Ligand binder design. Structure first.
Ligand SMILES: Cc1ccc(C(=O)Nc2cc(-n3ccnc3)cc(C(F)(F)F)c2)cc1C#Cc1cnc(NC2CC2)nc1
Ligand SMILES: [Cl-]
Length: 302
């Protein structure tokens, strides 16, 4: 559970929304047991106008474990409340059928795919041509700032993410990021970034050593994952530890202090943050609040 028990968190019934007022559309993503579909919600706004949303729900393949996980997810999201760097919960459907979790629809998709389709036209300094929506260094700095602020908020609410990575960051217009957790709606079975370890399938390359070797998730283990996320960002969407399978050698090398080199586009001061995030001692890692103050100053001087 880490610090808080989600089952004990309350569900504010102000979120409850009539499920008959949702019309399901295309599936945006799906795992073994859950999925996220695009939908239109009628009467979500005071005007009769229907607005587009995203809905997370379980599949008929799901078991009692996944049913509780989705309800626990809803409790956590309601407990967190609205925050600008987090995907916006809009409503939920809890009675009259299965649990539905309704969030905003983010038009530009996940950050990892965004980085990969923008990689070839990346601009390190200035854009002449503005209409092309070229990815810039200024954008990457802002991305890392917004995600750090979002994680500082989660930390202040005693919430551990456990799967922070570019694939779990959504993008809206103006290059605003929203931290997400697609969880059961991601096909982790066939995603090479998740690795068999014991009876589970885990994002090992994003995980801190203490998490790998004794399944502990802390404030500080999320900070490790953030450092890996920065490497993704400033490599423009590359997979971490390239050409290096997850095996006994990988775990040994990480435990003995091997760390990635700086990605091709990382400012030296952003790489400095990565190295501290990857400190073997979790107490020497920075906090998300400290990371926010660090990046803020970098942007000032940019
Ligand atoms: C519908 C939905 C429901 C829930 C979430 C979600 O993130 N839940 C979440 C859960 C936990 N949690 C805690 C404990 N157990 C789980 C923690 C976090 C947080 F905040 F900590 F990160 C979040 C996301 C969506 C979505 C979407 C969507 C996809 N695609 C596009 N658009 C692209 C172009 C097509 N837009 C929107
Ligand atoms: Cl199914």
């Amino acid at each position: 559970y880490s610090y808080i028990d989600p089952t004990q968190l309350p569900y504010d019934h102000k979120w409850e929304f009539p499920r008959n007022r949702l019309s399901f559309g295309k599936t945006l993503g799906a795992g073994a047991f859950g999925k996220v579909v695009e939908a239109t919600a009628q009467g979500l706004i005071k005007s009769d106008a229907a607005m587009t949303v995203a809905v997370k729900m379980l599949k008929p393949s799901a078991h009692s474990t996944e049913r509780e996980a989705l309800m626990s997810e809803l409790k956590v999201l309601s407990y967190l409340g609205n925050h600008e760097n987090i995907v916006n919960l809009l409503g939920a459907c809890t009675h009259g059928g299965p649990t539905l979790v309704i969030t905003e629809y983010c038009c530009y998709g996940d950050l990892l795919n965004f980085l990969r389709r923008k990689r070839d036209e990346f601009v390190p300094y200035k854009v002449a041509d503005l209409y092309k929506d070229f990815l810039t260094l200024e954008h990457l700095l802002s991305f890392s700032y917004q995600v750090a602020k979002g994680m500082a908020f989660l930390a202040s609410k005693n919430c551990i993410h456990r799967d922070l990575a570019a694939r779990n960051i959504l993008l809206t217009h103006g290059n605003i990021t929203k931290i997400c957790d697609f969880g059961l709606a991601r096909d982790i079975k066939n995603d090479s970034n998740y690795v068999d370890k014991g009876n589970a399938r885990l994002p090992v390359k994003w995980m801190a050593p203490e998490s790998i070797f004794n399944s502990v998730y802390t404030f500080e283990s999320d900070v490790w994952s953030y450092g890996i996320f920065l490497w993704e960002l400033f490599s423009l969407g590359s997979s971490p530890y390239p050409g290096m399978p997850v095996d006994s050698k990988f775990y040994k090398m990480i435990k003995e202090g091997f760390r990635m080199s700086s990605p091709e586009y990382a400012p030296a001061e952003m790489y400095d943050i990565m190295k501290t995030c990857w400190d073997a001692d979790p107490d020497k890692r920075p906090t998300f609040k400290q990371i926010v103050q660090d990046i803020e100053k970098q942007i000032s001087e940019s």
